[PDB]
Amino acid sequence: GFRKMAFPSGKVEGCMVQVTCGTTTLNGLWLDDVVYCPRHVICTSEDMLNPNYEDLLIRKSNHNFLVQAGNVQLRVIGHSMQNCVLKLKVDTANPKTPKYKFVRIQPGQTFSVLACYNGSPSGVYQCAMRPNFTIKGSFLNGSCGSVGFNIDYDCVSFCYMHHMELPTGVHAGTDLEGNFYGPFVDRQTAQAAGTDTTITVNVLAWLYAAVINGDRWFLNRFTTTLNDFNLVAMKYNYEPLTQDHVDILGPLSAQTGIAVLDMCASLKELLQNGMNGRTILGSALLEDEFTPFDVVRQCS
Amino acid sequence: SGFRKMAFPSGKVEGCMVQVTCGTTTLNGLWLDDVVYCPRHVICTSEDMLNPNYEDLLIRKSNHNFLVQAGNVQLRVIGHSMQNCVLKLKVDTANPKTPKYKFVRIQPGQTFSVLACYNGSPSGVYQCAMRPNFTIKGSFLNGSCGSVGFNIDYDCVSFCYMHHMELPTGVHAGTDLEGNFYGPFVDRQTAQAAGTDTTITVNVLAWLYAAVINGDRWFLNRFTTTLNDFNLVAMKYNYEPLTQDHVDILGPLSAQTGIAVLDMCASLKELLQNGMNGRTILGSALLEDEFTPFDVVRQCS
Numbered sequence: 001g002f003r004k005m006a007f008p009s010g011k012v013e014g015c016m017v018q019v020t021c022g023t024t025t026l027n028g029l030w031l032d033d034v035v036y037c038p039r040h041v042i043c044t045s046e047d048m049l050n051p052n053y054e055d056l057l058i059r060k061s062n063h064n065f066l067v068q069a070g071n072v073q074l075r076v077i078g079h080s081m082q083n084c085v086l087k088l089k090v091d092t093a094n095p096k097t098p099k100y101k102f103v104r105i106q107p108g109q110t111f112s113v114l115a116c117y118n119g120s121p122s123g124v125y126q127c128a129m130r131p132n133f134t135i136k137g138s139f140l141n142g143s144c145g146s147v148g149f150n151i152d153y154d155c156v157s158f159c160y161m162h163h164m165e166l167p168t169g170v171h172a173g174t175d176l177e178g179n180f181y182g183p184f185v186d187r188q189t190a191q192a193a194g195t196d197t198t199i200t201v202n203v204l205a206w207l208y209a210a211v212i213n214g215d216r217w218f219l220n221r222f223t224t225t226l227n228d229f230n231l232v233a234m235k236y237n238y239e240p241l242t243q244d245h246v247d248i249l250g251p252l253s254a255q256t257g258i259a260v261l262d263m264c265a266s267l268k269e270l271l272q273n274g275m276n277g278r279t280i281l282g283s284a285l286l287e288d289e290f291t292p293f294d295v296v297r298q299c300s
Numbered sequence: 301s302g303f304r305k306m307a308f309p310s311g312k313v314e315g316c317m318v319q320v321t322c323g324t325t326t327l328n329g330l331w332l333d334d335v336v337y338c339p340r341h342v343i344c345t346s347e348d349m350l351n352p353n354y355e356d357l358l359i360r361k362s363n364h365n366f367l368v369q370a371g372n373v374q375l376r377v378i379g380h381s382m383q384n385c386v387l388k389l390k391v392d393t394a395n396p397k398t399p400k401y402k403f404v405r406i407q408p409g410q411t412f413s414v415l416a417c418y419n420g421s422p423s424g425v426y427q428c429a430m431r432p433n434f435t436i437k438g439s440f441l442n443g444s445c446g447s448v449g450f451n452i453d454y455d456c457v458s459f460c461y462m463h464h465m466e467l468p469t470g471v472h473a474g475t476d477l478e479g480n481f482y483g484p485f486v487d488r489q490t491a492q493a494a495g496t497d498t499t500i501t502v503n504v505l506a507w508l509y510a511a512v513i514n515g516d517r518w519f520l521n522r523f524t525t526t527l528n529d530f531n532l533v534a535m536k537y538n539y540e541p542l543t544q545d546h547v548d549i550l551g552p553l554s555a556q557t558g559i560a561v562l563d564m565c566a567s568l569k570e571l572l573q574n575g576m577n578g579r580t581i582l583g584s585a586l587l588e589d590e591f592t593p594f595d596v597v598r599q600c601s
C-alpha cells in the first residue's frame with residue numbers, strides 16, 4: 001500500500017508551549033531554555049497593518065510574555081528577535097528537548113507539520129515546500145508557531161514555523177532563523193504568491209510507487225530524451241528535471257525495471273492526454289508531494 | 301480541496317510501543333500499565349503459521365520464552381494469557397508513559413490514525429478508514445504486525461486496531477485490542493481475500509456538508525427522500541446503506557448548515573443518478589469517502 005505518511009510527532013509534541021502577549025495567543029517551540037515563536041505575537045490588531053517590529057519589541061518587557069507548558073507558567077528572563085522569530089529565554093530547561101538542528105529546506109522537499117492550538121498538538125500531516133514557497137497546509141486561527149520537521153535517526157530537523165494564510169488558502173512561514181520562505185511578509189495584508197509549478201521529480205517518484213503497488217495502466221512502450229521531456233514539462237508548468245533528479249530516481253528505476261526516461265515518456269503522455277477519467281493510487285490528479293526518498297522509505 | 305488526511309499526534313502512542321520476540325519472530329506490542337498486548341501469532345514459527353494450533357502452541361510456552369523490550373531494555377514477563385487473537389503479557393513494570401486510554405471497537409467508515417512500527421520503533425503515522433468490507437488501505441511492511449490504530453479525544457487515547465495481515469489486493473486486516481478480528485479473517489497463513497467493497501455513504505455526505513460549509517453548494521436541491529428509499533437506491537450504486545447512527549453523527553453538520561440529513565441524501569441520490577455532468581465539488585470530480593463527520597468538523601472548525 002501507499003499513504004502520505006508523517007513522521008511520528010512525539011519528539012516535537014514535548015516541545016510545544018503556549019505564548020501570550022496582550023490578547024494574542026499562539027504556539028511556541030521550547031528547546032533547552034529558549035522558546036521560539038512568531039514575533040507577531042507582540043502586535044495588536046492596530047499594529048498588524050504595518051508593524052515596526054524593532055520599535056514594538058523595545059517597548060516590551062520580559063513580564064509582558066506569558067509562556068505556559070501545560071498547567072505550568074515558565075518565567076521569561078530575556079528576549080531577542082531573529083528576523084521574524086522571537087526567542088524567549090526562560091529559567092528552566094526542557095528535559096524533553098530532542099537532539100535537533102535547524103535547517104532550511106529546498107522547494108520540492110517534504111516535511112511533517114504538527115498543527116497546534118494554545119500550545120496543544122492537534123494533528124500531524126505531510127507537506128511539501130512548493131516551488132513558489134507556499135505550503136498547502138491545514139491551519140486555523142491560533143495555529144501560528146506550529147512547526148514543520150523531518151526526523152533522521154533520533155535527530156529532529158526543524159524546517160518550518162507557521163505564520164500566515166494567503167487568500168487562495170495556501171500557507172506561508174519561516175525557517176527557524178525567522179526568514180520567510182518566499183516573498184511574504186508578516187503584516188496583516190492580502191498577499192499573492194508567484195505562479196506555482198508542479199514538482200516533477202516527485203510526480204515521477206509517485207508513478208513508480210503506483211507501479212510497485214500494481215498500477216501500470218499509464219505506462220507505454222516509448223522513451224524520451226531528458227531535454228525533450230523538459231520542454232513539455234515547462235509548457236505544462238512542471239519544474240524541469242535535472243540529471244541529479246534522474247540519479248536520485250535510480251533506486252526506484254532499478255527496483256521496478258523502468259528506466260527514468262521511460263517513466264518520463266509515461267508522464268509526458270499523461271500531461272498531453274490526461275487521465276481520461278482513470279485514477280492512479282486512488283487519485284484523479286497527479287500527486288507531487290512524495291519525494292523519491294519518501295517513496296523508497298515507505299516501499300522498502 | 302482544502303482538506304487533507306490529518307493524523308492524531310502520535311506521541312502518547314509512541315510512549316507505549318514495545319517489541320515482543322519469540323524465537324526469531326519479532327513483532328510490535330502495546331504496553332499499558334503492566335500489560336503488553338500483541339498479536340498471538342508471535343508464538344508461531346514461520347512454518348507454524350501455515351496451519352497453527354494456537355492453544356497447543358501456547359501451552360508449550362512459559363513466561364521466560366517471551367522477550368519484551370522497550371528499545372533495547374528488557375521488560376520481564378510475569379504472566380501470559382490469550383484473548384481471542386491477542387496475547388496479553390503481564391510485565392513487572394507499569395509503563396510510566398501510560399496515557400488515559402480505552403479499548404474501542406469501531407464501525408466501518410470510522411477513521412483512525414495508524415502508527416506504523418518496526419521492532420518496537422515508530423516509523424510513520426497516517427490516517428486510515430475502516431472499509432465496509434472490514435479492511436483498511438494501510439501501508440505496512442514485514443514486521444509491522446502489532447502496530448496499532450487509535451483516536452485521541454481530549455487526552456484519552458481510544459485504541460481501536462491492531463495490525464495482523466495483508467491480503468492479496470494489497471489491503472490490510474486486523475483486530476481490536478480485545479483480539480477480535482474486524483471482518484471474516486483469521487490469523488493463519490492461508491489464502492484469504494477481501495469481500496467486495498462499497499462506498500462509505502455517511503462519509504460522502506460529510507464531504508458534501510464540508511463543500512456547503514465552504515460555499516460550494518450547486519448540488520443542493522428542493523427535494524427530500526425517506527431513509528429507506530435512499531438506502532435501496534444507494535445499494536444499486538454500490539454505496540453503503542445508512543444506519544440510524546450515521547444519521548445521528550451527521551447531526552452537527554446538519555445543524556451547522558441548516559440542511560436536513562435526508563435533504564442532503566436527496567442531493568446525493570441525484571448526483572448518483574445523473575452524475576456530475578463535468579462539474580466539481582471542492583475542486584474534484586470524485587466524491588471523497590474517507591473523511592468522517594468528525595474529521596470535517598476538525599478541519600473546518
Ligand SMILES: *C(=N)[C@H](C[C@@H]1CCNC1=O)NC(=O)[C@H](CC(C)C)NC(=O)OCC(C)(C)Sc1ccccc1
Binds near residue numbers: 141166
Ligand atoms: C496564526 N496564528 C495565524 C494563522 C492563519 C489564520 C488562519 N489560517 C492561518 O493559517 N496567522 C495570521 O492570522 C497572520 C498574522 C499576520 C500579522 C502575518 N495573518 C493572516 O494570515 O491573514 C490572512 C488574510 C490576509 C486575512 S487572507 C484574506 C484576504 C482578503 C479576504 C479574505 C481573506
Ligand SMILES: *C(=N)[C@H](C[C@@H]1CCNC1=O)NC(=O)[C@H](CC(C)C)NC(=O)OCC(C)(C)Sc1ccccc1
Binds near residue numbers: 444466468488491
Ligand atoms: C505482520 N508482521 C505481517 C504484516 C504483513 C507483512 C507484509 N505486509 C503486511 O501487512 N503479517 C503477516 O505476515 C501475516 C501473519 C499471519 C499469521 C496472519 N500473514 C499474511 O498477511 O499473509 C497474507 C495471507 C493471509 C496469506 S493472504 C495473501 C495471499 C497471497 C498473496 C498475498 C496475500
